[model samples]
Target: QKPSLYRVLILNDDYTPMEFVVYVLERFFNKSREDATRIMLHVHQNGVGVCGVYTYEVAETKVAQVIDSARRHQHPLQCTMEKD
Candidate 1:
C-alpha cells in the first residue's frame, strides 16, 4: 500500500499567546523565527494554520507533541490531523 499523506493543523484562539504559538512553530516545526511569526499571524487571521504535511507517524507525533506542550503551558491551543 502507498503511504497516506496527512496534514497537521494548529487552531487559533485568544487564550494561547501568539508568542507561544510562534515558539511552538519554530521549536517543533523547525520553522525559522520569521516564518513562524508569519504562520502564527495566518492562524490569528484565519482561525487555523497548517504546520506541514507528513506521513501518518510524523503527523501523529506532531499532534501529540503539540497537544502536550499546549497543556503544559495551560493554553487552549489545539492541533488536528486530516488525510489528503
Candidate 2:
C-alpha cells in the first residue's frame, strides 16, 4: 500500500480574527511572519488557506493542535485536513 498524503487548511470566518490566523500559521506551520501574513491574506480574500501537506497522522495532529490552540486562545479559527 502506498503512503497516504493530506493537506491541512484554515477556514475563513468573520469571527476569527485576522491576527489570530497569522499567529496560528506561524505557531503551528512554522511559517515566517511574511509567509503567514501572505497566507492570512489569501484566506481573507479567498475564504480558505493551506497550512501544509503531511502524512495522515501528521495532518491529524496539526488539525487537532490548531483546534486546541484556537480554543485556548478563544478564537473561532478552524483547521481541517483532506486528501491532497
Candidate 3:
C-alpha cells in the first residue's frame, strides 16, 4: 500500500534566529539556500510554514530532529508533522 504523505511544519518564534530556521530547512529538508531563505521568511511573516511532505515516519523523524537540534542550541524553535 502507498503510504499517505504528511506535511512537516516549522513554526516561528521571537527568539529563534532566522538564520537557524534557514539552516534547518537546508540541512534537514534539503532545500537550497534561496528556497530555505524564502521559506524562513514565509514562516517569519506567516507564523508557520511547510517544510515539505513526506511519509509519516520520515515526517515525524524530521520534526523530532528539528526540535532536538533547536533545544541543543537553546533556541525555542518548534516543528511538527500532520497528515496531508
Candidate 4:
C-alpha cells in the first residue's frame, strides 16, 4: 500500500512568542501576516499549527527551513512532519 500526503506541523510552546510564530509562518511558510497570525493563534490556543501539506521531500524541506530560520532568529520553534 501507499501512504497519503504529508504535512509540516508546528508545535506550540508557552515560551515561544506569537510574534515569532508569525515570523516563522511568514519566513518559512511564505504566509502573509493575516494568515500567519491566524495559524499562529490556532497553534497558540490549540497547541499545533498545520503549516503546509506537501510530498515527502517538500515536507522535509519545509521542516528544515523552519528549523534553520528559527535557529537564525534564535527562536526555539518546534516543527514536525506527519503523513495524513
* Total clashing pairs for each candidate: 0, 0, 0, 0
What TM-score against the true fold does each predicted structure earn? 0.92, 0.91, 0.95, 0.85
Q: What is the lDDT of residue 31 in candidate 4?
A: 93
lDDT of 1 by residue, 1-84 (tens): 875899989999989999999989998889998889989999999999998888888999999999999999999899999996
TM-score of 1: 0.92
lDDT of 2 by residue, 1-84 (tens): 775799999998888888888888998889999999999999999999999999999999989999999999888888899998
Best by TM-score: 3
lDDT by residue (1-84, candidate 4, tens digit) is: 887789889998877778888988887788998899999999989999899888998889989988887788777888999997
| Cα RMSD for predicted model 4 | 1.8
Q: Per-residue lDDT of 3-79 in model 3, one digit per residue for the tens?
A: 69999999999999998999999999999999999999999999999999999989989999999999998999999
Give the Å error, residue 68, model 1.
0.5
lDDT of each: 0.92, 0.91, 0.95, 0.87
Per lDDT, the best of the predicted structures is 3
Residue 6 of model 4 has an lDDT of 96
lDDT minimum window of 10 residues, candidate 3:
1-10
Candidate 2: list runs displaced more than 4 Å.
Answer: 1-3
Worst-scoring 10-residue span by lDDT in model 4: 68-77
RMSD of each: 1.5, 1.5, 1.4, 1.8
